[PDB]
Design an enzyme around this catalytic site. Structure first.
Site, short mmCIF file in Angstrom:
data_model
loop_
_atom_site.label_atom_id
_atom_site.label_comp_id
_atom_site.label_asym_id
_atom_site.label_seq_id
_atom_site.Cartn_x
_atom_site.Cartn_y
_atom_site.Cartn_z
N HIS A 136 59.07 108.32 -8.78
CA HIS A 136 60.16 109.29 -8.63
C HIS A 136 59.86 110.58 -9.13
CE1 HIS A 136 64.21 110.81 -8.08
NE2 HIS A 136 64.53 110.79 -9.29
N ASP A 180 67.18 97.83 3.18
CA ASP A 180 66.62 96.93 2.25
C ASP A 180 67.45 95.68 2.20
OD1 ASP A 180 64.99 99.11 1.66
OD2 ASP A 180 65.39 98.94 -0.62
#
Ligand SMILES: CCCCCCCCCCCCCCCCCC(=O)OC[C@H](COP(=O)([O-])OCC(O)COP(=O)([O-])OC[C@@H](COC(=O)CCCCCCCCCCCCCCCCC)OC(=O)CCCCCCCCCCCCCCCCC)OC(=O)CCCCCCCCCCCCCCCCC
Ligand SMILES: CCCCCCCCCCCCCCCCCC(=O)OC[C@H](COP(=O)([O-])OCC(O)COP(=O)([O-])OC[C@@H](COC(=O)CCCCCCCCCCCCCCCCC)OC(=O)CCCCCCCCCCCCCCCCC)OC(=O)CCCCCCCCCCCCCCCCC
Ligand SMILES: CCCCCCCCCCCCCCCCCC(=O)OC[C@H](COP(=O)(O)OCCN)OC(=O)CCCCCCCCCCCCCCCCC
Ligand SMILES: CCCCCCCCCCCCCCCCCC(=O)OC[C@H](COP(=O)(O)O)OC(=O)CCCCCCCCCCCCCCCCC
Ligand code: HEC
Ligand code: HEM
Ligand code: HEM
Ligand code: HEM
Ligand code: HEM
Ligand SMILES: COc1c(O)c(C)c(C/C=C(\C)CC/C=C(\C)CC/C=C(/C)CC/C=C(\C)CC/C=C(\C)CCC=C(C)C)c(O)c1OC
Ligand SMILES: COc1c(O)c(C)c(C/C=C(\C)CC/C=C(\C)CC/C=C(/C)CC/C=C(\C)CC/C=C(\C)CCC=C(C)C)c(O)c1OC
Lengths: 55, 238, 76, 41, 373, 373, 76
Positions: F194, F221
């Site tokens: 991230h 997802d």
């Protein structure tokens, strides 16, 4: 400085000596258990096998 | 229940270890008198080496006793001489057998007889020599004995130690007491095969912490002196 | 984080290097007086509850014993 | 004062002295400690 | 490094109050104890078998045949005891110094306390002694108290009509898995705290006097770790059975129940309360409240001062609370007979009345004395 | 809110590239598979016993007497297979699209890959079948390669002269404890990423076109989770024994050895390499390098373009690499005899030469074609 | 985070509400052409390698069997 650091160096060895000891005993734990070591015993009978055979 | 008194045992010492001649004598007692009915399952001939007997003495002790199981070419369980790896013999084949050969009562495995009971060494000794006549007002049925210490004072076990019950190989007079003290030391031994060792670790441990603590505190006081000397002053510009 | 914690003004703060000052200045010299000073400011708040815990514990024990002790008058 | 300037001032040497000392300390500690335990029991 | 930032944000450059006493060490000790337990637990798991035929045999094999296996086992048991000692002192620090006003940290704490108690209960069931089996049946039976779904729940957990192998194996799995959830909840506990910073014993805003942690307080946590290790090793190497029960060294007999069944010491206070309430359900509830009353604690703070350093009447009430907590710990031990019962009943009444009623009224009175109310 | 701040940062308001294909689903699938494995593993742990007398009996008791225990066991086995399928496709995505330039994320990845392989190996040892015992011995004796440190180390893991109960129990403890370390390493994996954000299939800076994750890559997802669940269940409920081995349904006989022994499919590529190198040590090393060559991968990138979307020669070399990886997977299965051996030897030579030599030279040539070099 | 990701200028971006647009506009209308467009763009760079794999596979299997096959001259 040498007085204060000598205390740091002294302490370190002590800790170092304990730390090796603690860590050592655990490694020994994962090592052969007393019982497992007690297996050196064994017996066989020659008559059991004739020529050209394995047992 | 009667609360067994405190006896001046050597191993009770904080830095004191077990008297190993007493453990050897107490192992003899079991071997001869109490083994036929109680079971030291968790103690094997191997554990004794380096404690009470040598390798050849414990090997002879193990080969006096005989194993009776383990299959054969015919899947035929057979009786064989036990070894340093074999465990101590069992008095009865199964729990029922125990009830049968002990008037219904089950003699508990002594493997950890002391760690098991609260009075521990003290209690065992208290009872072993605590056999006594039931007073007036109390009456016990057959297969029961008034042992003040035993819970209820009615232990199925009959008094097993009569003075000179067995002869100590060392020759130390086999008085009932000398025998109860030896078997209490031994039973203690089985319950903690490392009493001595644990105590050696506790000694060195004490010493090590004994050097580390003061020093660490000192350092705690070096790195905290700076603040503990800090002087604050308020200076309003005024 | 540091720098944005608080706003103070005109508060000067002096200090000394660790190696320049004695490690245990008057440790037992004033330590004892202080520890004693401390104990006398907190002992009256702390101790009497534990004192009456000790009395209740003993009482319970003895009372329990007496309770267990056979009633002589009974059974006679 | 010499020691500080020799084995305790350079951190690398500080570590060296610590490690070496610890290597021997065990020998001494164990030996001394054992003597005591034996004497006790 | 991005990871390094986390370290320098939670352990090195964290601004900590300069005046926090040794009590603030205890939580760090708890974390160390958690690791210690996990490490010792892992080295118990390489030889323990969760089968009712072989569990006691595996424990004796650990104590007698594994090299230093007695050391790791008694370190695990006395480390559970040390965990509960440090937990009780941590909770007492939080109650005394007004740290419950950090409400999210306090609630994550009481969740951690519930998880640690469940972990220790199932761990004590795990060696399958006489005391473990009768103790398990007892508390599992506690659940049956539930008004409607109780029976089912009990049977579910037991995994059968009565605790038997079915239980032991699932208790081994749950006792294995919960300390990692405890570690994750402790990470959440540390986060919810750094947002606000630690409290100080004066209870005031310590923003004017904060110091680093790594060079300054670490040597303090290291010294506390050394002292806690001294007490743990003198508990293990010198008195390895002063806190345990002797009857756990007998195998589990379903046909005989040890006459004197007592839960371990740190459960005693609760045990007393349960026994005190006549109604079974009442006992279970009160028991739960005993732990839960703490969570309820941040809504009972009625004082304008956070800490008890400047509050003597509430200090007296706090030490009376510690006193009858010790009394409830003693009573649990005592058997069921006069006058242990009455003390238990009063001690429970006094415990709930001091926490619920007496402390906020005392805080109102203390605010009135300083011309604040 | 502190937590919600964290939550919003890694899953809701995270700026993700708008053009990432279905391959970027796979890592999330891996996380789901990890949880699935852990959950199924926990429900295997409530009935499994790590004793060599009772391990096979406990597994059969799970399959035959526990309600839906066959379902949880075959879900665990085929979920390990699904884990390795998703792992291989995740690594292939990282190799193809130049995602190894996120070097810390890549190194935490290869650590996770080593941990997952060790966990699956000890888990396959756990049911104590014929195949598990001979596989353990074989794979462990492999460790006996090291001349001075190896032999003892082997028996150390074996905890005795030869794998026996000593091993099974410590393998149960490890296999239990390592997926939580895998979860923590996956948290570190997500953090190290991230900081840099995900890559896109074009390999360009996607800062001009980023979208939220909640409504765009969450439902994606969820759809990928649904498809992966379709494949797993249809590999458990209809073809449950497809990926396994029949000789694992026999009990572990130390006196006999399964005639045809092979690692599970996922560990074969390595198996082939090991068998290929004549020297035992060489095999072990090459084997390790087989996995480690990946870590070495971010230092071999010699191109000015990150991804292989605009690089056709290196695309051809990549698909030749996938081709001889499939060849090495096949060879491992084949027995030791001509000409399987030669293929194995070549395939290993071609694998190491394509990763080490051919791709950077091809990237230099591709940079020369665009008038960049 | 968003707002500080990048700097673009004068790039207008139009869009429509989900419920206002058909869910599968010309899904098979252009989907097929596109899927086919796509395959022909990578097929020459994906399949060729694996084709040879099928080949080695087959040759390998057959060769092995032949090796097992008894040698006619053997024993004769
Ligand atoms: C059973 C309980 C088991 C508990 C195990 C863990 C205990 C952790 C203690 C940590 C600790 O004491 O270190 C900080 C503390 C910091 O040192 P300090 O600045 O001198 O502290 C002085 C007071 O102790 C400073 O005292 P304070 O005002 O900070 O608070 C009193 C202090 C306890 O000290 C007391 O005065 C009350 C003791 C009861 O707090 C406790 O330790 C509570 C212990 C409860 C038991 O170190 C010690 O107290 C022990 C020093 C040992 C020196 C050895 C030299 C050779
Ligand atoms: C050719 C016949 C279908 C057709 O003409 O539709 C055109 C269409 C191509 O349209 P396009 O404008 O060229 O591409 C835009 C996408 O379709 C835009 O939608 P999409 O297809 O990317 O949908 C999201 C995607 C999301 O995909 C995933 O999440 C995959 C997750 C990983 C795989 C599952 C995990 C386990 C993997 C184990 C190995 O779902 C799929 O890709 C499903 C693929 C199914 C392939 C066909 C066989 C059924 O083909 C499909 O949509 C295939 C999916 C539906 C069939
Ligand atoms: C499998 C074949 C998938 C396929 O359809 O091949 C063509 C496709 C082309 O992808 P690309 O060139 O990026 O163009 C995308 C245009 N929208 O190719 C792709 O979609 C890119 C696929 C990249 C990842 C492929 C992973 C294959 C499996 C590798 C496993 C082994 C990896 C190493 C393990 C050690
Ligand atoms: C690693 C953490 C180390 C923490 C500090 C340990 C200090 C140990 C000091 C005693 C050393 C000693 O007595 O040597 C002989 C003794 C071994 O006896 P010997 O092998 O017969 O010499 O070593 C120990 O006592 C080790 C003590 C282990 C426990 C120490 C505290 C561990 C806490 C939990 C860690 C997880
Ligand atoms: C030949 C029979 C026999 C011998 C020898 C024997 N015991 Fe016992 N013992 C029993 C029986 C039967 C019980 C069970 C009595 C009961 O439970 O009420 C018992 C119980 C005990 C108990 C309490 C546990 C229990 O369940 O009662 C202790 C302690 C004990 N024995 C110690 C010893 C010691 C010490 C020796 C020898 C040094 C010894 N015993 C030898 C038959 C014997
Ligand atoms: C994941 C980490 C842990 C593992 C793997 C673990 C494992 C074990 C195992 C195998 C036993 C049985 C052997 C024994 O009797 O000691 C056990 C017992 C025990 N565990 Fe744990 N444990 C863990 C964490 C904890 C924690 C955190 C506590 C404290 C809350 C705890 C408290 C206990 C207790 C009290 C016992 C019983 C001790 C006794 O036999 O008297 N365990 N543990
Ligand atoms: C799992 C057991 C626990 C662990 C490991 C733990 C650990 C910690 C740690 C490491 C800290 C920071 C260091 C410190 O403040 O001393 C802390 C702070 C704190 N904990 Fe705990 N804790 C536990 C249980 C609890 C419980 C049950 C409560 C509630 C009663 C609680 C309430 C607090 C509070 C209020 C603080 C902040 C203290 C302050 O700064 O004023 N914790 N905890
Ligand atoms: C435990 C198994 C693994 C899981 C669950 C996992 C999961 C993930 C996830 C969720 C992402 C974010 C990308 C996305 O979902 O769109 C990711 C990215 C990545 N993973 Fe993995 N991964 C695993 C193993 C590995 C391994 C073994 C490697 C190295 C070979 C690796 C290398 C990477 C890289 C380089 C990225 C950044 C690629 C990108 O997001 O553009 N991972 N992983
Ligand atoms: C904490 C997480 C996990 C736990 C508690 C766990 C627990 C278990 C247990 C008890 C078994 C033996 C029961 C049986 O084999 O049927 C087992 C088997 C297995 N586990 Fe795990 N496991 C976990 C994670 C994993 C992971 C991450 C993998 C993949 C790397 C894995 C792969 C396997 C495999 C392959 C088997 C053997 C399957 C078979 O018998 O064919 N497990 N697991
Ligand atoms: C000023 O406030 C703080 C503080 O903010 C922090 C981070 C710590 C550091 C906390 C620890 C070292 C304990 C960590 C807790 C754990 C549970 C460690 C993780 C353990 C696992 C098993 C995982 C303090 O000790 C402290 O008080 C002085
Ligand atoms: C767009 O880029 C990202 C992204 O930035 C992140 C953080 C994730 C992570 C989100 C997930 C749903 C995966 C969860 C990751 C794990 C490692 C799960 C770990 C499981 C545990 C039990 C811990 C992605 O899946 C993803 O691509 C889709």
């Amino acid at each position: 400085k040498g007085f204060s650091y000598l205390v740091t160096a002294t302490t370190t060895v002590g800790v170092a000596y304990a730390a090796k000891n603690v860590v050592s005993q655990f490694v020994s734990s994962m090592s052969a258990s007393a019982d497992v070591l007690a297996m050196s015993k064994i017996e066989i009978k020659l008559s059991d096998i004739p020529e050209g055979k394995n047992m | 229940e009667l609360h067994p008194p405190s006896y001046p045992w050597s191993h009770r010492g904080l830095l004191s270890s077990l008297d190993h001649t007493s453990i050897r004598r107490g192992f003899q007692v079991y071997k001869q008198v109490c083994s036929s009915c109680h079971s030291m399952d968790y103690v094997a001939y191997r554990h004794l080496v380096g404690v009470c007997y040598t390798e050849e003495e414990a090997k002879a002790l193990a080969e006096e006793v005989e194993v009776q199981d383990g299959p054969n070419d015919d899947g035929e369980m057979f009786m064989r001489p036990g070894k340093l790896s074999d465990y101590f013999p069992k008095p009865y084949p199964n729990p029922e057998a125990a009830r049968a050969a002990n008037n219904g009562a089950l003699p508990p495995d002594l493997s950890y007889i002391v760690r098991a009971r609260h009075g521990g060494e003290d209690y065992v000794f208290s009872l072993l020599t605590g056999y006594c006549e039931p007073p007036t007002g109390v009456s016990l049925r057959e297969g029961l004995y008034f042992n003040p210490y035993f819970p209820g004072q009615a232990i199925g076990m009959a008094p097993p130690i009569y003075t000179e019950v067995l002869e100590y190989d060392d020759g130390t007079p086999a008085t009932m007491s000398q025998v109860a003290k030896d078997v209490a030391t031994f039973l203690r031994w089985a319950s903690e095969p490392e009493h001595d060792h644990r105590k050696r670790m506790g000694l060195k441990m004490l010493l090590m912490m004994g050097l580390l603590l003061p020093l660490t505190y000192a350092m705690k006081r070096h790195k905290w002196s700076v603040l503990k000397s800090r002087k604050l002053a308020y200076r309003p510009p005024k | 984080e540091f720098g944005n914690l608080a706003r103070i003004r005109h508060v000067i703060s002096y200090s000394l290097s660790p190696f320049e000052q004695r490690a245990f200045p008057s440790y037992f010299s004033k330590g004892i007086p202080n520890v004693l000073r401390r104990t006398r400011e907190r002992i009256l708040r702390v101790a009497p509850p534990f004192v009456v815990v000790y009395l209740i514990y003993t009482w319970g024990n003895q009372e329990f014993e007496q309770s267990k002790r056979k009633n002589p008058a009974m059974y006679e | 004062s010499r020691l500080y300037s020799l084995l305790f001032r350079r951190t690398s040497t500080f570590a060296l002295t610590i490690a070496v000392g610890a290597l021997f300390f065990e020998r001494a500690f164990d030996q001394g400690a054992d003597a005591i335990y034996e004497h006790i029991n | 490094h991005p990871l390094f930032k986390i370290i320098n944000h939670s352990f090195i450059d964290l601004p900590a109050p300069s005046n926090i006493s040794s009590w603030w060490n205890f939580g760090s000790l708890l974390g160390v104890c958690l690791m210690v337990q996990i490490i010792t637990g892992l080295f118990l798991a390489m030889h323990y078998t969760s089968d009712t035929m072989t569990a006691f045999s595996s424990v004796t094999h650990i104590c007698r045949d594994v090299n230093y296996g007695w050391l790791i086992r008694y370190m695990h048991a006395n480390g559970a005891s040390m965990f509960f000692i440090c937990l009780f002192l941590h909770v007492g620090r939080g109650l005394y110094y007004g740290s419950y006003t950090f409400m999210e940290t306090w609630n994550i704490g009481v969740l951690l306390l519930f998880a640690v108690m469940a972990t220790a209960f199932m761990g004590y069931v795990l060696p399958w002694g006489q005391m473990s089996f009768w103790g398990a049946t007892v508390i599992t039976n506690l659940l049956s108290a539930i008004p409607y779904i109780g029976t089912t729940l009990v049977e579910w957990i037991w995994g059968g009509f009565s605790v038997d192998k079915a239980t032991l194996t699932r208790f081994f799995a749950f006792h294995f898995i919960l300390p990692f959830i405890i570690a994750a909840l402790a990470i959440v506990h540390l986060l919810f705290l750094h947002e606000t910073g630690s409290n100080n014993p004066t209870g005031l805003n310590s923003d004017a006097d904060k110091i680093p942690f790594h060079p300054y307080y670490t040597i303090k946590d290291i010294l506390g770790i050394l002292i806690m290790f001294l007490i743990l090793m003198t508990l293990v190497l010198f008195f390895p059975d002063m806190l345990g029960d002797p009857d756990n060294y007998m195998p589990a007999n379903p046909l005989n129940t040890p006459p004197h069944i007592k839960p371990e010491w740190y459960f005693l206070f609760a045990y007393a309360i349960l026994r005190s309430i006549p109604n079974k359900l009442g006992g279970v509830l009160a028991l739960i409240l005993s732990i839960l009353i703490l969570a309820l604690m941040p809504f009972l703070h009625t004082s304008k001062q956070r800490s008890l350093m400047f509050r003597p009447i509430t200090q007296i009430l706090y030490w009376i609370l510690v006193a009858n907590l010790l009394i409830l710990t003693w009573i649990g031990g005592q058997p069921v007979e006069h006058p242990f019962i009455i003390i238990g009943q009063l001690a429970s009444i006094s415990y709930f009345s001091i926490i619920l009623i007496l402390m906020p009224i005392s805080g109102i009175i203390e605010d009135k004395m300083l011309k604040l109310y």
